[PDB]
């Protein structure tokens, strides 16, 4: 039961704190992990914009893109985190692009499939 983050290129297994969220009152599920590394090592596999896939044990919980990465260090402590949401969250903050703003006689599934085409999300009815 290990949480593996399939970042771009390689696996990342051990973590210091994991918090995953899922709900049906929302259009995304956000995750936040805490990483701890010696000061000076390269953290480039965990960068904003990378393609991530969270895999708890052998099952996938979330898949999408990394959003934020915080690094801080004080006189007696050191803390690094990382965040991210689904690929469905790409629609939330991106403006809809379509040629003719009006659909004359269409159903909700067809409208959704025409609107979520440029991004890559697949609609399920």
């Amino acid at each position: 039961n290990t949480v593996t983050l399939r970042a771009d290129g390689r696996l990342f297994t051990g973590w210091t704190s994991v918090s995953v969220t899922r709900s049906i009152e929302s259009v995304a599920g956000y995750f936040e992990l805490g990483v701890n590394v010696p000061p000076g090592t390269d953290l480039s596999g965990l960068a904003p914009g990378k393609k991530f896939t969270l895999e708890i044990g052998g099952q996938i919980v979330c898949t999408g893109y990394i959003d934020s990465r915080r690094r801080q260090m004080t006189a007696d402590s050191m803390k690094i985190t990382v965040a991210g949401r689904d690929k469905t969250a790409d629609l939330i903050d991106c403006a809809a692009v379509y040629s003719g703003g009006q659909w004359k006689n269409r159903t909700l599934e067809q409208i959704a499939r025409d609107l979520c085409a440029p991004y890559g999300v697949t609609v399920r009815w």
Binding site: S26, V27, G29, Y30, R85, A89, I92
Partner: peptide, 17 residues
């Protein structure tokens, strides 16, 4: 941030409008 994260995540029940 309990509500501050619900804005960044989806909300199929609109808060306003």
């Amino acid at each position: 941030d309990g509500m501050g994260l619900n804005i960044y995540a989806g909300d199929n029940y609109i808060t306003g409008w």
